[PDB]
Design a protein around this ligand. Structure first.
Ligand SMILES: [Ca+2]
Ligand SMILES: [Ca+2]
Length: 312
């Protein structure tokens, strides 16, 4: 397997549990610090980063009824410049650029308690697919499915339904939607960290997935595995392999990686392309910092970059 060593440039530092890098509709850059704590209690933050100075601005420090959040993953909406944030303690949140937020669901469509979420990914239809490796959201005691298979997957539909689409995962983490060349969603890829596996489903429609299949294998025997992920414009899936010092590059069909990217750190946690560029911003937990490097090509256009009222 060929391996490349591009130059990684420091972007910002000192972000506890650096994670969920994302760009909004204005091109502003954000990341989350899920592990910031106050008196040992969860006090996660959502930060805006000045790409030119690297200076940090905490725009939101979520909390519901006294319970602080553990914001871990993000996706920028299209129909409004707002961020959907997966939170390990509060579930799904919608965060405005002004820092105000709202908790989306305390229970799912079947009336069962919502679970803590980790990452999410919009399909071009506007449906948000979410991973939920944690147990019930606050005020329930904090737990994670690293050892027991109770992690779940959700789909938040355009009509506002929070539907659990599957469960029994051992820490579902990164997630991504593979689209047909004409833009139709048809494959959901889910990372299950400890098992060193990438799972896929055939997307049949909103909150409808079938045929769970082992899609790809993550290299290494180290503690950790697939964390965050994203597709480039050719539909190659780049996955942060936490603990391996590499970002794995899978081809459209999966299987084994067809290439690897060596990082100047051991724990890449998540990544995200800057719109209209080949630049990938990476969050990592060895130094709790954010970096950037140039990929061989541009990233797959995110849902927020598409036009709802376009002709084509
Ligand atoms: Ca993650
Ligand atoms: Ca990303």
């Amino acid at each position: 397997i060929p391996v490349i060593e591009p130059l990684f440039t420091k972007v910002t530092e000192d972000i506890p549990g650096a994670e969920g890098p994302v760009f909004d509709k204005n091109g502003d850059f954000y990341i989350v610090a899920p592990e910031v704590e106050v008196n040992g209690k969860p006090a996660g933050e959502i930060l805006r980063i000045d790409l030119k100075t690297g200076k940090k601005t905490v725009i939101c420090k979520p909390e519901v009824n006294g319970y602080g959040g553990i914001p871990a993953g993000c996706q920028c909406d299209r129909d409004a410049n707002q961020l959907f944030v997966a939170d390990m303690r509060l579930g799904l949140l919608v965060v405005q650029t002004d820092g105000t937020f709202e908790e989306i669901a305390k229970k799912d469509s079947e009336g069962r308690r919502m679970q803590g979420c980790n990452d999410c990914a919009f399909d071009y239809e506007g449906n948000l697919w979410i991973t939920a490796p944690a147990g019930e959201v606050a005020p329930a005691d904090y737990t994670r499915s690293m050892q027991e298979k109770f992690g779940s997957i959700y789909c938040f539909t355009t009509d506002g339904q929070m539907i659990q689409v599957d469960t029994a995962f051992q820490f579902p983490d990164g997630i991504a939607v593979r689209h047909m060349n004409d833009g139709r969603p048809y494959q959901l890829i889910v990372a299950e960290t400890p098992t060193k596996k990438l799972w896929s489903y055939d997307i049949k429609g909103p909150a409808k997935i079938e045929n769970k299949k082992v899609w790809g294998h993550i290299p290494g025997t180290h503690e950790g595995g697939a964390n965050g992920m994203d597709f480039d414009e050719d539909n190659n899936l780049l996955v942060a392999n936490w603990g391996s010092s590499h970002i794995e590059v899978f081809g459209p069909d999966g299987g084994q990686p067809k290439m690897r990217i060596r990082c100047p750190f051991e724990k890449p946690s998540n990544l995200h392309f800057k719109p209209q560029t080949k630049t990938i911003f990476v969050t990592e937990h060895e130094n709790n910092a954010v970096w950037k490097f140039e990929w061989q090509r541009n990233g797959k256009k995110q849902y927020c970059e598409t036009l709802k009222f376009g002709i084509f």
